[PDB]
Amino acid sequence: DAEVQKNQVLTLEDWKEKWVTRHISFHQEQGHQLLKKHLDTFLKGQSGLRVFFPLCGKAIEMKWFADRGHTVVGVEISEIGIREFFAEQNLSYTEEPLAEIAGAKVFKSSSGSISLYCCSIFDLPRANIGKFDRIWDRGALVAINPGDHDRYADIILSLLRKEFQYLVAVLSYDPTKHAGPPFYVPSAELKRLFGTKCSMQCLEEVDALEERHKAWGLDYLFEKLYLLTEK
Numbered sequence: 001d002a003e004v005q006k007n008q009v010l011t012l013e014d015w016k017e018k019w020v021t022r023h024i025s026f027h028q029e030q031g032h033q034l035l036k037k038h039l040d041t042f043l044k045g046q047s048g049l050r051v052f053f054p055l056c057g058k059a060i061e062m063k064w065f066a067d068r069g070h071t072v073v074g075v076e077i078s079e080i081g082i083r084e085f086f087a088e089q090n091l092s093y094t095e096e097p098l099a100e101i102a103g104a105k106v107f108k109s110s111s112g113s114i115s116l117y118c119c120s121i122f123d124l125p126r127a128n129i130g131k132f133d134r135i136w137d138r139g140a141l142v143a144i145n146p147g148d149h150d151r152y153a154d155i156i157l158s159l160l161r162k163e164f165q166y167l168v169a170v171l172s173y174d175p176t177k178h179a180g181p182p183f184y185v186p187s188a189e190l191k192r193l194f195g196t197k198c199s200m201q202c203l204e205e206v207d208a209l210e211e212r213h214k215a216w217g218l219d220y221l222f223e224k225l226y227l228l229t230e231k
């Protein structure tokens, strides 16, 4: 089952086109769901955290963290999605080109609490963005092409400070029922990618089977939230 979607891809241009065409869906209404349920364990009572959001889209959580005094950085290939974030969140921003990455740009809120890099996550190393106390990964790992898991994991690990908390959600479903994204990422895969370098705790497993998965054609859907910290 783990290899069923192994050769399935969406390309960077495919993702940009989903945004252009409005063929992208955001079923996230109050933010996420198990978002706030575990925010306290994630923050571990600290202030002024530097928090990275891979494949951030226009995630409202980025504004929640910024509102609370944390420094937020996101990466998102779609310029359209990034601009929608600032619009939806009613925030002004600047645009600057990225020297190290052809055609790339960074969009930053006017007082700097949110910086959204418009480029591929795989190009981020060249942008010299430093490291992070926290990484928030909802939808990102499960959006990555299965073939690119190791490349993604390596980048994630390279962006972590020595002490960190990395919150990552994965989805369990029958991979023969649905060609991703989101892709099927079993616990075994999360372990393969991060277990050498991170301690792993399952915080919660919930039954996520609902409405729109009627045309997805799924008999079951579980989402598991994991908290990864230094070994």
Ligand SMILES: Nc1ncnc2c1ncn2[C@@H]1O[C@H](CSCC[C@H](N)C(=O)O)[C@@H](O)[C@H]1O
Binding pocket: 012, 015, 016, 019, 028, 054, 055, 056, 057, 058, 059, 075, 076, 077, 078, 081, 119, 120, 121, 122, 138, 139, 140, 143
């Ligand atoms: N390699 C890549 N680098 C940067 N962004 C990517 C990417 N591959 C996909 N994306 C973007 O990643 C997002 C994946 S969908 C998840 C969006 C967000 N994490 C949320 O839950 O709200 C899309 O907005 C897509 O345009």
